[PDB]
């Protein structure tokens, strides 16, 4: 399968770049309980980070300028971000790493689904220990070159760390590697780390000789959150972004912008996400399909619990069906929620994974309208 052809299943990314008279504060309390950032992620099954972040969109110039032959993806889970990168840059090879709980044979599930094969992942971390897959461990960085002898020009980190200290542990280790490593030193100090960070306190200095070049605030990030992507390099250290700066960019995006839908619809993926939400749910999701699902339940303890869960889902999809076609924005998402009477029953009955799937299906339905 052609990687550039697969790129049409990924939505266009909206973001703000902050390069490193009182400003004023932009506030908007959206009365929402659902993770609406998954609204345009219906074409992806195991992970969907590529719908939020892109290397061509955010750091396209650096990608052009450095021209890496190998990219290093750490804390990458199912590898949807790596999969989008493989579609944007079809000649790039990858070194993949993500924290593993066992010695069992693992592989980025989303990359395999999107790209087809793993031939471009020259190091998938096969046969690696738990610590050798942990970005906060020295051994992880010492075995990063076991296959690839290319310098860490651009390292991508999307790890969801336990505590904020873990982020620093990783950054310090990246710095310690790029300044000791025979391969990386031979290159120079023009080495980059594009890492996920949760901006909380202000005036938090980055480790010694780690400088922030830019901060990226993504539309696809949880609205209540403080998540951003920082582009780091070697040089005189500066401050990390603070919660304040991030919220203002997070708010302008939420208030001003709409979510772009993917140009093409991956029907196999949508059908997979539907069956993941409510087993047996088929596309197109219409009046007929919702009455069919309602008819399956009346044909008849955990038995009453799973049917209660099903009624909750059908009821929500029925509300989406009987709702006007609007633009994909938080003003419309707030209208959708605040016009549904059983919102609190919905969040109580459904689990986090089910609710994320419910929003992906809702998004498919909203895009399908008219
Ligand atoms: C948000 S997911 C990455 C999603 C990825 N960008 C994608 O497209 O699928 C975060 C991943 O980081 C991993 N992780 C958590 N702590 C880690 C650590 N200390 N070192 C490395 N990976 C870690 C988690 O196990 C999880 O798979
Ligand atoms: Zn190195």
Residue numbers in the entry: 1616 to 1635, 1642 to 1921, 1936 to 2005
What does the paper say about this structure?
The Mononegavirales order groups five families of monopartite, negative-strand RNA viruses many of which are highly pathogenic and/or contagious; the Filoviridae (of which Ebola virus is a representative), the Bornaviridae (Borna disease virus), the Nyamiviridae (midway virus), the Rhabdoviridae (rabies, vesicular stomatitis virus (VSV)) and the Paramyxoviridae (measles virus, human metapneumovirus (hMPV)). These viruses encode a large RNA polymerase (L) (usually >2,000 amino acids) that is crucial to viral replication. As a part of this study, we expressed CR-VI+, a 406-residue fragment comprising CR-VI and the adjoining ‘+ domain’, the variable region carrying the K-K-G-motif, investigated its MTase activity and solved its crystal structure. Besides sequentially methylating the 2′O and N7 atoms of small capped RNAs, CR-VI+ also 2′O methylates uncapped substrates and displays nucleotide triphosphatase (NTPase) activity. Both the CR-VI domain, which assumes a fairly standard MTase fold, and the K-K-G motif of the (mainly helical) +domain are required for the MTase reactions.
Most notably, hMPV and flaviviruses share an unusually long (∼10 residues), flexible β2λ (that is, the loop immediately following the β2-strand), which forms the SAM-binding pocket (SAMP) along with loops β1λ and β4λ, shielding it from the solvent. In CR-VI+, β2λ similarly assumes alternate conformations. In the ‘closed’ form, the ligand’s ribose group is hydrogen bonded to D1725, and—via a water—to D1722. Loops β1λ and β4λ also show a degree of flexibility. β1λ residue E1697, conserved in paramyxo- and filoviruses, forms a hydrogen bond with the NH2 group of SAM and is essential for both MTase activities.
